[PDB]
Structure 1
């Protein structure tokens, strides 16, 4: 399936801020007005590609998803990073684990770290060995589509790991998400009087 990635793949280009400008740059980005693939939360865990960082979102308020499954070959012979939602701390472990056709939790270690009306909109990217956490928790009103609107993304945490680009599985629990990829496009942004992104334009769109 596919839906329309209208505008919302946009983040602050670095830990770094101007005010009231129209500044241009380039990085890996979700391109504007492109297709973005839509999937289900049935009962599954399908196979999806991962192309140099993704724009990820899902409409939820009740902790359906639990995190992301990383690892270069994902069968306990790999340097596997893990993201676990706890409802207390988003914890990160870099170890070896055992994975199945449905590895989740429901109803050689080298690195450790401890920290519907809503959209938890996350972007992971891995430039030069640096794994970065770009986020936005925004409230919305409807459920079936990404709205015609605008959003910005903010940084949380840098982490030096350097492992994954090809593919993955993901986490669920027993009791719908958006996924769209990045590519190098030169842009033009806008900082407001506050220095938040309020509108931007992809150069290579039309």
Structure 2
């Protein structure tokens, strides 16, 4: 199934404070009103990755708990495994081996450790760095990806050098989730008095946005 992305999938572009200003930047973004793919775990196939991925999932009951990323997933090369399950974050980057159907049962160069609601995440792999941004909010709409804006904040940057073309999400076994590819796009971003990114324009969306 599919849904319209609306104004979703925007993040803080660099670790610099700016305020009371409009700022123009070019990066991998989810284009406004782009064609998002939609799933119901309540349904976790392997999917392509391309240049980068926006991922989001709904929440009330903690069904979707992590992700796997790589190319072949057969220990012949490195892969990324992320757990994020509200009680724990655990991340490792080994030459992993897996089955075709991984779940949480009811050479590792690096490690990191730490509906009612909506969870948003962005994953991109640039110049040998794999980078993570996220945002979390209450919602009313059970049906679909809700129309609105809020910028994703950087969590983690990994200098890990892994080549990636595919990914998958992880379930607890013996929620709804959304996927959309980023594209190289120019955005105009609004920084308020506190340096919150409060609004954005996709400069390639239509002639008025270009204006």
TM-score for both structures, normalised by structure 1: 0.92
C-alpha deviations, 1:54-94, integer Å up to 9, x for none?
A: 11101013221121112332012221221123543311112
In the other structure, the counterpart of 1:9 is 9
Q: Which SS does the other structure have where 1:37 is aligned? A: strand
C-alpha deviations, 1:150-206, integer Å up to 9, x for none?
A: 221111122111214311222112272110111111111101122111111101011
Q: Distance in 1 between matches of 2:47 and 2:72?
A: 15
Please state how far the C-alpha of 1:126 moved relative to its aligned partner.
Answer: 1.5
In the other structure, the counterpart of 1:21 is 21
Gaps spanning 5+ residues in structure 2: where? 207-211
Distance verdict in 2 for CA 1:153–1:111, change over 3 Å: same
Aligned-residue Cα RMSD (Å) equals: 1.6
Given that 2:56 and 2:178 are in contact with CA atoms closer than 8 Å, whether structure 1 keeps it comes out as yes
Q: Which SS does the other structure have where 2:178 is aligned? A: strand
Given that 2:70 and 2:165 are in contact with CA atoms closer than 8 Å, whether structure 1 keeps it comes out as no
Structure with bigger strand share is 2
Please state how far the C-alpha of 1:20 moved relative to its aligned partner.
Answer: 0.9
Q: Distance in 1 between matches of 2:147 and 2:80?
A: 34
Given that 1:95 and 1:110 are in contact with CA atoms closer than 8 Å, whether structure 2 keeps it comes out as yes
Please state how far the C-alpha of 1:33 moved relative to its aligned partner.
Answer: 0.9
In the other structure, the counterpart of 2:197 is 197
Q: Which runs of 4+ in 1 moved over 4 A?
A: none
What is the count of residue pairs matched by the alignment? 205
Distance verdict in 2 for CA 1:96–1:156, change over 3 Å: same
Given that 1:107 and 1:173 are in contact with CA atoms closer than 8 Å, whether structure 2 keeps it comes out as yes
Gaps spanning 5+ residues in structure 1: where? none
Distance verdict in 2 for CA 1:102–1:125, change over 3 Å: same
Please state how far the C-alpha of 1:123 moved relative to its aligned partner.
Answer: 0.5
Given that 1:8 and 1:150 are in contact with CA atoms closer than 8 Å, whether structure 2 keeps it comes out as yes
Given that 1:38 and 1:177 are in contact with CA atoms closer than 8 Å, whether structure 2 keeps it comes out as yes
Q: Distance in 2 between matches of 1:190 and 1:182?
A: 20
Given that 1:72 and 1:163 are in contact with CA atoms closer than 8 Å, whether structure 2 keeps it comes out as no
Distance verdict in 2 for CA 1:190–1:87, change over 3 Å: closer
TM-score for both structures, normalised by structure 2: 0.90
Distance verdict in 2 for CA 1:187–1:86, change over 3 Å: closer
